[PDB]
Amino acid sequence: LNDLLICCRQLEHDRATERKKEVEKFKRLIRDPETIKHLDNWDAVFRFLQKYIQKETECQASRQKKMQEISSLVKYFIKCANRRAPRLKCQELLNYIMDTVKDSSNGAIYGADCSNILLKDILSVRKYWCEISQQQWLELFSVYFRLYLKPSQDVHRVLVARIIHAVTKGCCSQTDGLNSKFLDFFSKAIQCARQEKSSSGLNHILAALTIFLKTLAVNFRIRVCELGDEILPTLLYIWTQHRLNDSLKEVIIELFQLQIYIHHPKGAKTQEKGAYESTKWRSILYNLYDLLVNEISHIGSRRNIAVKENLIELMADICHQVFNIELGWEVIKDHLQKSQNDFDLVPWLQIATQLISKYPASLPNCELSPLLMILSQLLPQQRHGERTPYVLRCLTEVALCQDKRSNLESSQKSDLLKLWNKIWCITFRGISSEQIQAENFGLLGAIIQGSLVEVDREFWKLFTGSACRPSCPAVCCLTLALTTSIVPGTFSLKESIMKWLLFYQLETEVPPILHSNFPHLVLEKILVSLTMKNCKAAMNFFQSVPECSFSEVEELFLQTTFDKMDFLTGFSVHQNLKESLDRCLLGLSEQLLNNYSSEITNSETLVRCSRLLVGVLGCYCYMGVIAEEEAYKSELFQKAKSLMQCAGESITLFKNKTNEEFRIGSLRNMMQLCTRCLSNCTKKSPNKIASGFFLRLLTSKLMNDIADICKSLASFISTIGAINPLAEEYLSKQDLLFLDMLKFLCLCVTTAQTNTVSFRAADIRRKLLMLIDSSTLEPTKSLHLHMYLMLLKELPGEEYPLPMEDVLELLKPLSNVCSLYRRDQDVCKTILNHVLHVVKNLGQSNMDSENTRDAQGQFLTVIGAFWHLTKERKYIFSVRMALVNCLKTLLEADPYSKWAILNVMGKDFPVNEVFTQFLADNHHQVRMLAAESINRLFQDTKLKALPLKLQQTAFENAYLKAQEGMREMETLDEIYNRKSVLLTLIAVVLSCSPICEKQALFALCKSVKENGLEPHLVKKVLEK
């Protein structure tokens, strides 16, 4: 250490001729013991190299090579300094990279190399990706945009843009964003892009602009609309003039879609329904429709003749926004009719299909009949063409749209009935084709569900014999045929259908139903209902049970404009058929059992068949045919248990040969199947009873083997910016398998308590908690973070809480984990989202021992640390939203704040008082989440109300906070946003509280004149 420093000082003090050899001497001076003893410093040798460079650069073109050399040297040094871990501090290295490229004296290749080091070594490391402050991000963005905007053109310009694309992604996701005054830069980069044909970095500049606009859309929406009005004509001109590179057009389409989303949130058409309108925007919309219409009739817009879907969605959005120069469905019908070849006809079919599906009200009922006639004329060509699957999908969308309308005239309905009968006649013939089985059966199901065509006896012949194989579309059409019709008697047809569904090929192909996954409890319901006295009643009874991006910004816009307000809103069975079904099931199960081999036979097929058996039993037990106790003694249960035993030995084999990789593919599939076999929902349904039967299937040995393999698997050892540590690309096949079996074990432990099972849930839960033991758990490891997060999310349950010791063990590693990932915003948000599920077990103070108090304090200190850091401006709006959600859950679990008090700096804060503070936040999303969730302060929400004084003081504090947020105030967007929060809070209080109704109404009356609330808006709220 000291000797190395002395040698470095001597080399630095040597003469230039001596320094020439001293460079190589210092390069070779590094060694493994030197690095081992140097772990802390590296900054000392960094400044040594820095003054060496500053002295060398001062002393023609002959210097250029030297520069290259020294560049390589520092690069090599960096690669040697940060190879094992990022020991080198980000700050001074960032300033060095800043000022080496800031000056123009350095060579262009030197600047390109320095930018290469910046991109590949600084911005590619998560730690440096996080420790960069907001000022550093803004200065790097500014200087690099100045570099890009320079008139000098080289290859490195492209590499400049890739830096900016990175920098913006680092500025919009790790800090509170960059100021809106930076919108000029991009605008400049756009305007010059009009002149130069090269457009070296436009592909990355526009992609970074998309991220900036997405971040800058929650606030300053009018500013973004004006920016779009400014730049969109230039983008249209670029599209028309440019060489049309696929990446550039793809990014431009994304920008156009973002602009449409911002202007028309979720299809808002009129200004009074949430849309923002301008004359320039309307002209832009018409020009962009013309551009898309022209560009669609191109070879590259798509062997395959289908236009890429993003173009189709953009075209459909534009058409919906410009349909009422006159535009309408007339041009679509004309293009559908006149076009001869399928090249120019498929795009219009796709446009019509997407427009009808996304906007069912966009097609007038007067034009429905001509469209149906055109589609019927387009169906047949005596054979199967390229256009047929698209025509079938368009017809399916039309059929689904028709059934959603009740204002249809009788003459119109009777005319459409004839066309639908003709359509059925056309499509039913030619159903034997395997290529369009999905589309054909989808059209048939759409027609049947709406009762558009009376089902004939020929239809029921489809699900018999070898006419068609059992598939998801065919079974989904059959489950609607049973729902909306009665099977004819051609004891014979029902038995034939049951045999067709359960037809097993004798002696080695698996039956088709076992081969492919089917929707849960869909085959079982059909099979059970086919044996019932009244098939249609059984189907309807089964169907009557209840089941268990930029969209958020559009919802926030709608809430801000107040167009969206979430608040203020026994049977009898044919014995012969029942026994025939049991005979078929026994035959299939024993056929699987005998054909099963310990090595070659698949495992997910056995699990699928056992799922079918237990689903049939659960469907029978849901009705009055069979009780649970008798179902436990049925031969179907024994066959399912044997199937489970056969499947378990596949896991048992893997328990020893963990090194295998081909086993993992099947093991993951079978784990997913077993996971979806269960159901955590508690409402009585066939799903719950089937899940109970499947729970009783599992044995103790299989569960112990799964737990042992999970224990073993945890002991093992391009992208724009740095990779998220929670990213899926860090997960190997074994890691994914471990995550699957961990979820399966968690579900089994959670839902075992309701029934009586062969395995002990306590031991498995003890092993699961042993997985996150302090000695073994390494939070920095990617797999261990996922495992801990999954355990935090899945283990707690309000209905049957964890023992307080188990909850204490669960929260034990939380503080260290949060300390480790303090600077990572995404990981902090995920941790806050996942720790919210502990509050349900935490809240119950029935066993108010030392353990309950300890667990409550342990959770509250972690939440208080996050709140204190948030007040210290250490977290972005996403972490603030996660914290608001956690505080909302705490308020739900303790309305009176008996125990939900967080202590910071020796000061106690009730959660109710803290939650009000977020009403005056600097981000509109957090404000409108707090305002929308403020109803927890007025009702128990466990729907009893709260005491008079508590409600009064809560409303007074919330109203004062909302007023204060307004008071401390180009800026039109902020004013509108603050008024929206005030009005939303008052409306929520009015809707959720009869005690404070008069007070809220008087507050609204006062704020109409004091805070300048727009009367036309509060009137709209008051009408609702």
Break the chain down into helix, strand, coil percent, rounded to 5. 70, 0, 30
Torsion sign across C-alpha atoms 221, 879, 769, 802: negative
The answer to whether 358 touches 319, Cβ cutoff 8 Å, is no
Nearest to 671 by CA among 740, 736, 720: 740
CA distance 53 to 673: 62
Looking at the DSSP assignment, which residues form a beta bridge with residue 909?
A: 902
Question: ∠ at Cα 695 (692, 699), nearest 5°?
Answer: 150
Asked whether 388 and 440 are in contact (CB, 8 A), the reply is no
Q: Which residue has the tokens 């060509």?
A: 381
For the four alpha carbons of 716, 719, 721 and 726, in that order, the dihedral sign comes to negative
Please give the backbone phi and psi of residue 945, each rounded to the nearest 5 degrees, phi first. Answer: -90, 175
**CA-based nearest residue to 217, from 704, 549, 484, 653:** 549
* Structure token pair of residue 184: 């000029």
Q: Do the bridges between strand 907-910 and strand 901-904 make them parallel or antiparallel, or are there none, so unpaired?
A: antiparallel
Residues with Cβ within 8 Å of residue 253, at least 6 apart in sequence: 310, 311, 314
Angle at 666 between CA 662 and CA 671, to 5 degrees: 135
DSSP state of 922: S
Residue 708: exposed, middle, or buried by beta-carbon count in 10 A (0-12, 13-18, 19+)?
middle
Rounded distance between C-alpha atoms, residue 265 and residue 269, angstroms? 9
Tell me whether residue 234 is exposed, middle or buried, using C-beta atoms within 10 angstroms of its C-beta: 0 to 12, 13 to 18, 19 or more: middle
Sign, CA dihedral 367-370-374-379, equals positive
Q: Which residues contact 981 (CB under 8 A, 6 or more apart)?
A: 919, 924, 927, 928, 931, 962, 965
Q: Which tokens go with 724?
A: 């998220």
Give the separation between CA 424 and CA 376, rounded to whole angstroms: 10
Backbone angles phi, psi at 899, to 5 degrees: -125, -15
- 442, 473 Cβ separation under 8 angstroms: yes
| Residue (of 654, 743, 737, 751) closest to 694 by Cα position | 751
Distance separating alpha carbons of residues 403 and 761, to the nearest angstrom: 49
Per-residue three-class SS string for 565-582: CCCCCCCCECHHHHHHHH
The answer to whether 148 and 161 have CB atoms below 8 angstroms apart is: yes
Q: Cα dist. 699→309, 611, 618, 702, 826 in Å?
A: 48, 15, 19, 6, 40
Report the Cα 471 to chain-centroid distance in Å: 29
Print the SS3 string covering 365-393: CCCHHHHHHHHHHHCCCCCCCCCHHHHHH
The residue with tokens 């070849």 is: 341
Q: Which of 764, 827, 758 is nearest to 794 (CA)?
A: 764
**Is 504 within 8 Å of 585 (Cβ atoms)?**
no
Q: How far is CA 607 from CA 15, 558, 947, in A?
A: 78, 46, 55
DSSP 3-state assignment of 876?
coil
Give the burial class of 614: count Cβ atoms within 10 A of its Cβ; 0-12 exposed, 13-18 middle, 19 or more buried: buried
Partners of 902 in the β-ladder: 909
Please give the Cα distance from 688 to 678 (Å, whole number): 8
Q: Determine how many CB atoms are found less than 10 A away from the CB of residue 199.
A: 19
Distance CA(193)–CA(964), nearest Å, equals 45
CB 448 within 8 A of CB 484: yes
Alpha helices in 16-118, H assignment, sequence order: 16-29, 32-37, 42-58, 62-81, 90-102, 108-117
**Residue type present at position 665:** G
Q: Pick the closest to residue 751 from 795, 709, 790, 814 (CA basis).
A: 795
**C-alpha distance from residue 429 to each of 393, 423, 433 (Å):** 17, 10, 10
C-alpha span between 908 and 914 (Å, rounded): 10
Reported resolution in A?
2.5
Residue 189's φ and ψ, nearest 5 degrees, are -60, -25
| Contact (CB, 8 A) for 581 and 531 | yes
φ and ψ at residue 596, rounded to 5 degrees:
-65, 135
| Cβ contacts of 816 within 8 Å, gap of 6 or more | 779
Method: cryo-EM
Report the C-alpha gap between 391 and 439 in whole angstroms.
9
With the CA atoms of 575, 576, 577 and 580 taken in that order, what torsion angle do they form, in degrees rounded to the nearest 10? Answer: 120
- The DSSP line for 821-862 is TTT-HHHHHHHHHHHGGGHHHHH--TT-SHHHHHHHHHHHHH
Question: Residue 21's CB: how many other CB atoms inside 10 A?
Answer: 11
Identity of the residue numbered 892 = E
